[PDB]
Copies of this chain bind each other. A is one copy, B any other.
Amino acid sequence: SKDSDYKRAEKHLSSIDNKWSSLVKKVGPCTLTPHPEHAPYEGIIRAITSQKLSDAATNSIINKFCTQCSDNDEFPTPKQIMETDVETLHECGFSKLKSQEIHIVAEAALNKQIPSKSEIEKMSEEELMESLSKIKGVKRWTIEMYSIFTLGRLDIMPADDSTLKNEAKEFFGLSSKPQTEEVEKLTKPCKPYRTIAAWYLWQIPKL
């Protein structure tokens, strides 16, 4: 059904105006691939790792993380993460601060302090903001990324994203890099598929 969702999203975006129709046509079908099968602790750690880093840099770090902490080159279990000292994690490429935060997330998972996937699925984005922000290292941007790339939510507009703001400036022909609320206002017509709208804006550099 993700296919039907993307088709509906693409049709909606193409109905907004000339610029959206043109962008969707040039970029082609949305190929965004979320991974809801991932447990919350994994999705959260993947989101934290991506903070301030490009996809390529993030992937290189996660790859080393899996090779170091896992036995079957898979994503490390909470236990395996706790059995790895922060210095070893840092050696994988995580900043020292992220190394500490990842340890805390693993421990929270082991102690059942993180909401279950079942609970998270019933929570609105606003409720997720209130709940997950209680985790050290996890705030607005990280929760938006977890919502898009792990949960697969379709109407998330990461208006605070620097890259998206730069792309919105070009796309909307603005005289200056927009503030967060300005991006929120400009992309309102994209509802209820703002995640897909964000994805299309993120593809502009590739063009």
Residue A177 at the chain B interface, CB threshold 8 Å: yes
Oligomeric state, in copies: 2
CA distance A157 to B107 in the complex (A): 39
User: Digit string of A168-182 for contact with B (CB within 8 Å is 1, else 0)?
Assistant: 000000001101000
Interface size class of A (residues with CB under 8 A): under 10
How near does chain B come to A43, taking the closest CB pair, in angstroms? 26
Pull 5 A–B residue pairs with CB atoms less than 8 Å apart, ordered by A: A162-B179, A166-B176, A166-B177, A176-B177, A177-B177
Residues of B within 8 Å of A166, CB to CB, are: 176-177
Residues of B within 8 Å of A162, CB to CB, are: 179
| Closest 5 A/B residue pairs (Cβ) | A177-B177, A166-B176, A162-B179, A176-B177, A166-B177
CA distance A162 to B176 in the complex (A): 11
How near does chain B come to A133, taking the closest CB pair, in angstroms? 16
CA distance A179 to B163 in the complex (A): 11
CA distance A158 to B176 in the complex (A): 19
User: Digit string of A143-176 for contact with B (CB within 8 Å is 1, else 0)?
Assistant: 0000000000000000000100010000000001
Q: Which residue of B lies closest to A162 (CB)?
A: B179
CA distance A162 to B179 in the complex (A): 9
Q: Which residue of B lies closest to A52 (CB)?
A: B179
CA distance A177 to B166 in the complex (A): 9
How near does chain B come to A179, taking the closest CB pair, in angstroms? 8
CA distance A162 to B165 in the complex (A): 13
Q: Which of A166, A177, A179 has the most chain B CB atoms inside 10 A of its CB?
A: A177
Q: Which residue of B lies closest to A177 (CB)?
A: B177
How near does chain B come to A188, taking the closest CB pair, in angstroms? 21
User: Digit string of A117-140 for contact with B (CB within 8 Å is 1, else 0)?
Assistant: 000000000000000000000000
Q: Which residue of B lies closest to A176 (CB)?
A: B166
CA distance A176 to B162 in the complex (A): 11
How near does chain B come to A48, taking the closest CB pair, in angstroms? 19
How near does chain B come to A202, taking the closest CB pair, in angstroms? 16
